[PDB]
Amino acid sequence: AIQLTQAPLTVSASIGDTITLTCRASQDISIWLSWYRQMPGKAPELLIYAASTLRGGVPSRFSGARSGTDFSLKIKNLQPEDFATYYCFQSDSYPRAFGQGTKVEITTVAAPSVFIFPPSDEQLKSGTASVVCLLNNFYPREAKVQWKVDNALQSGNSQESVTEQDSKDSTYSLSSTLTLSKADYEKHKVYACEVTHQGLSSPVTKSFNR
Amino acid sequence: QARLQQWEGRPLKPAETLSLTCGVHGVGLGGSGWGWIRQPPGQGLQWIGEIDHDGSHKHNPALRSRLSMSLDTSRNQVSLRLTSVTAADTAIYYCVRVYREKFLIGEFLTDYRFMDMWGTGTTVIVSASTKGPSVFPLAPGTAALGCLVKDYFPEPVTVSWNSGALTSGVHTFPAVLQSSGLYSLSSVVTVPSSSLGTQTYICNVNHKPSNTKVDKRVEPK
Amino acid sequence: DDMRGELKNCSFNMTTELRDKKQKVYSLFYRLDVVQINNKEYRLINCNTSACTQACPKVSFEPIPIHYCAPAGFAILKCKDKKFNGTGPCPSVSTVQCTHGIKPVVSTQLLLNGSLAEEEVMIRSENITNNAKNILVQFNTPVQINCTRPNNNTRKSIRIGPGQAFYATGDIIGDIRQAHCNVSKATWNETLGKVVKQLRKHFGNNTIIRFANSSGGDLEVTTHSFNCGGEFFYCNTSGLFNSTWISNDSITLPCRIKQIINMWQRIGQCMYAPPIQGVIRCVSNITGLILTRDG
Amino acid sequence: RLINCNTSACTQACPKVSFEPIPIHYCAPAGFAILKCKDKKFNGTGPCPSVST
Ligand SMILES: *[C@@H]1O[C@H](CO)[C@@H](O[C@@H]2O[C@H](CO)[C@@H](O[C@@H]3O[C@H](CO[C@H]4O[C@H](CO)[C@@H](O)[C@H](O)[C@@H]4O[C@@H]4O[C@H](CO)[C@@H](O[C@@H]5O[C@H](CO)[C@H](O)[C@H](O)[C@H]5O)[C@H](O)[C@H]4NC(C)=O)[C@@H](O)[C@H](O[C@H]4O[C@H](CO)[C@@H](O)[C@H](O)[C@@H]4O[C@H]4O[C@H](CO)[C@@H](O)[C@H](O)[C@@H]4O)[C@@H]3O)[C@H](O)[C@H]2NC(C)=O)[C@H](O)[C@H]1NC(C)=O
Ligand SMILES: *[C@@H]1O[C@H](CO)[C@@H](O[C@@H]2O[C@H](CO)[C@@H](O[C@@H]3O[C@H](CO[C@H]4O[C@H](CO)[C@@H](O)[C@H](O[C@H]5O[C@H](CO)[C@@H](O)[C@H](O)[C@@H]5O)[C@@H]4O)[C@@H](O)[C@H](O[C@H]4O[C@H](CO)[C@@H](O)[C@H](O)[C@@H]4O)[C@@H]3O)[C@H](O)[C@H]2NC(C)=O)[C@H](O)[C@H]1NC(C)=O
Ligand SMILES: *[C@@H]1O[C@H](CO)[C@@H](O[C@@H]2O[C@H](CO)[C@@H](O)[C@H](O)[C@H]2NC(C)=O)[C@H](O)[C@H]1NC(C)=O
Ligand SMILES: *[C@@H]1O[C@H](CO)[C@@H](O[C@@H]2O[C@H](CO)[C@@H](O)[C@H](O)[C@H]2NC(C)=O)[C@H](O)[C@H]1NC(C)=O
Ligand SMILES: *[C@@H]1O[C@H](CO)[C@@H](O[C@@H]2O[C@H](CO)[C@@H](O)[C@H](O)[C@H]2NC(C)=O)[C@H](O)[C@H]1NC(C)=O
Ligand SMILES: *[C@@H]1O[C@H](CO)[C@@H](O[C@@H]2O[C@H](CO)[C@@H](O)[C@H](O)[C@H]2NC(C)=O)[C@H](O)[C@H]1NC(C)=O
Ligand SMILES: *[C@@H]1O[C@H](CO)[C@@H](O[C@@H]2O[C@H](CO)[C@@H](O)[C@H](O)[C@H]2NC(C)=O)[C@H](O)[C@H]1NC(C)=O
Ligand SMILES: *[C@@H]1O[C@H](CO)[C@@H](O)[C@H](O)[C@H]1NC(C)=O
Ligand SMILES: *[C@@H]1O[C@H](CO)[C@@H](O)[C@H](O)[C@H]1NC(C)=O
Ligand SMILES: *[C@@H]1O[C@H](CO)[C@@H](O)[C@H](O)[C@H]1NC(C)=O
Ligand SMILES: *[C@@H]1O[C@H](CO)[C@@H](O)[C@H](O)[C@H]1NC(C)=O
Ligand SMILES: *[C@@H]1O[C@H](CO)[C@@H](O)[C@H](O)[C@H]1NC(C)=O
């Protein structure tokens, strides 16, 4: 099959900029590579087909180039409707493939405000304990949460979820849940979430004692 | 006015048959080709298969022998019949029209297929029986409080605060699918710390699939 | 310059398998098959003269060798002389039960496939001094000619009645270069050299032998008309016959294609050769010529 | 529509010709003979000891 590599996976720019998106193919797929834009929550739509032809209705700002391996798409005069996920789709070989997706967003670096929440006693009666760590109103989206229980690094027992970018301040929020059995929860004292983020010179830890 | 409409098929039990149907209006099944594109949550799109103008069935190698598609020319409908559905097949399924335009390279003429027209989306989730959530408090310059909406099926759950009167500072997170096959989500709000003993905060949780509504008071512990 | 400049995209109402229902269909017809009526209005070329019985899709046009065998009381005498032109005594004779396999290859201006001469190029005319008589040249070494229609044709079926189907060119993609035949330039030059050497014996050593191209007339007579892969070609052969003879490279002959064929120089019995799916490729031996001399 | 209109057109059975089977006799030309096995327990294959022409 043919593998399409799309980089960078996340490019940030403000309104009224020019961005270039790259989609590198494995073999030479001639010029057969179409571009699709997926607005968050909506369905993908065709922007460019044959790597150069604009779809009927797409503004003239959008443009592609190249007919070899390093396909490129250029956006001019950025508008809020252009901040979506773009995909490159080849049509040369019948095992069709898509790109990984380039998430274009708006650009202030801000560290999260961090909060930790113990499980409720009502939940504990069920045999399971959820500890929740909130990372509020931060930018950029990349953040790292490490759970510690009596200083022991936890692995494999958490899940996390991130909001969409805020329309007014361009920040994100993140929620991570650590799931423990009640039996394990009651064997330990100190529950801590350690947060790493570009806006923090050293990690921030919020904790409680059971 | 040319649109492809597809309707939700509701959650389905694992190891069953996945029956999809797309409604083609404005245009007809003839002349183009019709295929299916999915999108697992938080991931990119994946090609399932297509029927080309000739009536010939291109299928993705990954889904081996469990693929079968058909075209209802009389009703202008495209069908998908994925079988033995596993939890990894939880994705939004799109119906697409691969349109053929001929592009002339220096001496060679090709039929170029470029998925002209996309469906709206059919969120397919496989798990579990309908189950309402348990709602637990996340109890508290600025303070954070919230509600943990745990162990429900299927999606979705909606959350408001103070019957919709509190919107500033609210974040309702995407649900996660837990290893149990049940979903969980959290909703939070940041408020002035000075308001915690005087203002009442209630998260309004609605889980339509089970007819479950919970108004959970979140007080400091 | 392309194949697509030879085609017209013709849309018409066709009968359905039900008598009271019509069928808006289209097909790609060669410009050589459609005649304008005065999106313009056209009609098939052999429509004021006859109706075209479709070349039946399950019968092949490939010639198989046929032996003509004499009945009882008759014998077939075979002249085994290798210098026998066409007339007069033959010192070596044989009685064969019947002839070698004679492939009925139908072609003009060039004897594709068939039997070679034994020792040298043979010139055979009924009266070599009469310019109204054709000269049948026969080669001793074949000249290989390669055909092609580079297009990837897409045959389309139309139900024109109960049980009857009309096969139409629905789409054409792929290499759109004009259909052509390649003859090796070195091999053809040395073959005309042998023809000229054997042709000066009847006209003089000091005479100038000049090969010109076909004078005029029907496309079936001005071109190397032949069948190859079920589709009928009409090649120019003006680069083959262009030379004056005084006492890796290849020659490309642009060929047109027709679907409505009046084969045996007749009027009132045409034939519609249906489209051949895919790319057509061709390997033949030029084993002879048919020449006419200018007065 | 009639069951056979996408395969062929159908020839009406002529109203004066009869489908009734009339016995027919297949007779061998000169220089040939028809041998008839008169064995009453013949199973269709093998030597027939009672043959007539
Ligand atoms: C030789 O000549 C031939 C002509 O004689 C050439 O063939 C033609 O080639 C055309 C160009 O390729 C092609 O046009 C394209 O048609 C698309 C629609 O497909 C049609 O036509 C087919 C004909 O076989 C039909 O089989 C289809 O069924 C369809 O017709 C539908 O049929 C319906 C009945 O079944 C009608 O009724 C609708 O039915 C619905 C049922 O629920 C509802 O009831 C509806 O309310 C009801 O209306 C429809 O009315 C009819 N629709 C028609 C007529 O359109 C069409 O989509 C293509 O255009 C779009 O896409 C291209 C590429 O993007 C754009 O450039 C265009 O601008 C246009 O885009 C816009 O719309 C799309 C959405 O569709 C948007 O995504 C886009 O952004 C734009 O807004 C295009 O017109 C011809 O159909 C075809 N004709 C024939 C006879 O085959 C042949 O190519 C040529 N060959 C050679 C070798 O040269
Ligand atoms: C020139 O242009 C023609 C089109 O006019 C090209 O022909 C098509 O090629 C594609 C592949 O490139 C074929 O698609 C595949 O279909 C096979 C199974 O096809 C069978 O069923 C078809 C529908 O009935 C039928 O058309 C097929 O062909 C027969 O019938 C036609 C007449 O209709 C006749 O002309 C042929 O000779 C055949 O007798 C055939 O019966 C399918 O298995 C293919 O593989 C895909 O899907 C599998 C999973 O199923 C997947 O694993 C593979 O990776 C792949 O995705 C694929 O669907 C198409 O059928 C052909 N169409 C026709 C009309 O023949 C031709 O290739 C071009 N040639 C050149 C030189 O480019
Ligand atoms: C096929 O038949 C239709 C009619 O059944 C033709 O359409 C008509 O064309 C004439 C002009 O010659 C108009 O006056 C009529 O109003 C048309 N009728 C319609 C559109 O219903 C059509 O031209 C024919 N197509 C051909 C001959 O290719
Ligand atoms: C059938 O129609 C064709 C086309 O009109 C006729 O051939 C044309 O004849 C005129 C008059 O001599 C010429 O000017 C045209 O050049 C001819 N066209 C072609 C394509 O050859 C033909 O004569 C008609 N046949 C009959 C029997 O009437
Ligand atoms: C001359 O003879 C050759 C060889 O038999 C013919 O080419 C063959 O054509 C058949 C049918 O199209 C193919 O199945 C064979 O594969 C061909 N052979 C080769 C070597 O290509 C050729 O068509 C003949 N020339 C004519 C009839 O004009
Ligand atoms: C066949 O080839 C000849 C020669 O290439 C073509 O006719 C002549 O071409 C030369 C230059 O290539 C011109 O100077 C002449 O005026 C042409 N004579 C014509 C057009 O009558 C010819 O077009 C080719 N095809 C056919 C069908 O004859
Ligand atoms: C002619 O039409 C008949 C009727 O549709 C065809 O027979 C049908 O074939 C389908 C298969 O697609 C079966 O599901 C039906 O049961 C068949 N009908 C009957 C009455 O048995 C038949 O195949 C067609 N023949 C041709 C040559 O097209
Ligand atoms: C053919 O050869 C014979 C015998 O050599 C000769 O008599 C005859 O004249 C030749 N044909 C012609 C047309 O001259
Ligand atoms: C004829 O020769 C040309 C180049 O001279 C080449 O492109 C073409 O493929 C050849 N065709 C055949 C049938 O040999
Ligand atoms: C014709 O084609 C054969 C292979 O099919 C090739 O070997 C030969 O060189 C070609 N000759 C010409 C004159 O194109
Ligand atoms: C013969 O060649 C001349 C030019 O050399 C051309 O005008 C004429 O049409 C040709 N005749 C044919 C190919 O029958
Ligand atoms: C042409 O003739 C040679 C021998 O002279 C033979 O090997 C070859 O197969 C022939 N090519 C055909 C008949 O296409």
Numbering used by the authors:
A (entry chain L): 1 to 107, 109 to 211
B (entry chain H): 1 to 82, 82A, 82B, 82C, 83 to 100, 100A, 100B, 100C, ...
C (entry chain A): 148 to 185, 188 to 309, 312 to 323, 323A, 324 to 397, 411 to 458
D (entry chain E): 192 to 244
Publication excerpt:
Broadly neutralizing antibodies (bNAbs) targeting the HIV-1 envelope protein (Env) inform vaccine design, hold potential for therapy and prevention, and advance efforts toward achieving a functional cure. On the HIV-1 Env trimer, bNAbs recognize highly conserved epitopes essential for viral entry. One such epitope is a V3 glycan site located at the base of the V3 loop. Here, we report on the identification and detailed characterization of the new anti-HIV-1 bNAb 007 targeting a N332gp120 glycan-independent V3 epitope of the Env trimer.
Fab was added in a greater than 3-fold molar excess to SOSIP trimer, and Fab-Env complexes were then isolated by size-exclusion chromatography (SEC). Structural analysis revealed four trimer classes with either 0, 1, 2, or 3 bound Fabs, with the most populated class being a 3.0 Å single Fab-bound trimer. The observation of sub-stoichiometric trimer binding by a bNAb Fab could result from a weak monovalent binding interaction, which is unexpected for a potent bNAb such as 007. In our structure of BG505-DS SOSIP with two copies of 007 Fab, the measured distance between the C-termini of adjacent Fab heavy chains, ~120 Å, was ~2-fold greater than this distance cutoff, suggesting that intra-spike crosslinking by 007 IgG interacting with the closed BG505 Env trimer in our structure would not be possible. However, one must also consider different structural states of the antigen that may be targeted. Docking the 007 Fab-gp120 coordinates onto the gp120s of an occluded-open Env placed the C-termini of adjacent Fabs within 65 Å. Therefore, one possibility to account for the apparent involvement of avidity effects in 007 interactions with Env trimers is that the 007 IgG binds bivalently to an occluded-open or other altered Env conformation that was not observed in our 007 Fab-SOSIP complex structures. Interestingly, in gp120 protomers bound by 007, but not in unbound gp120s, a portion of the V1 loop is disordered suggesting that 007 binding destabilizes the V1 loop.
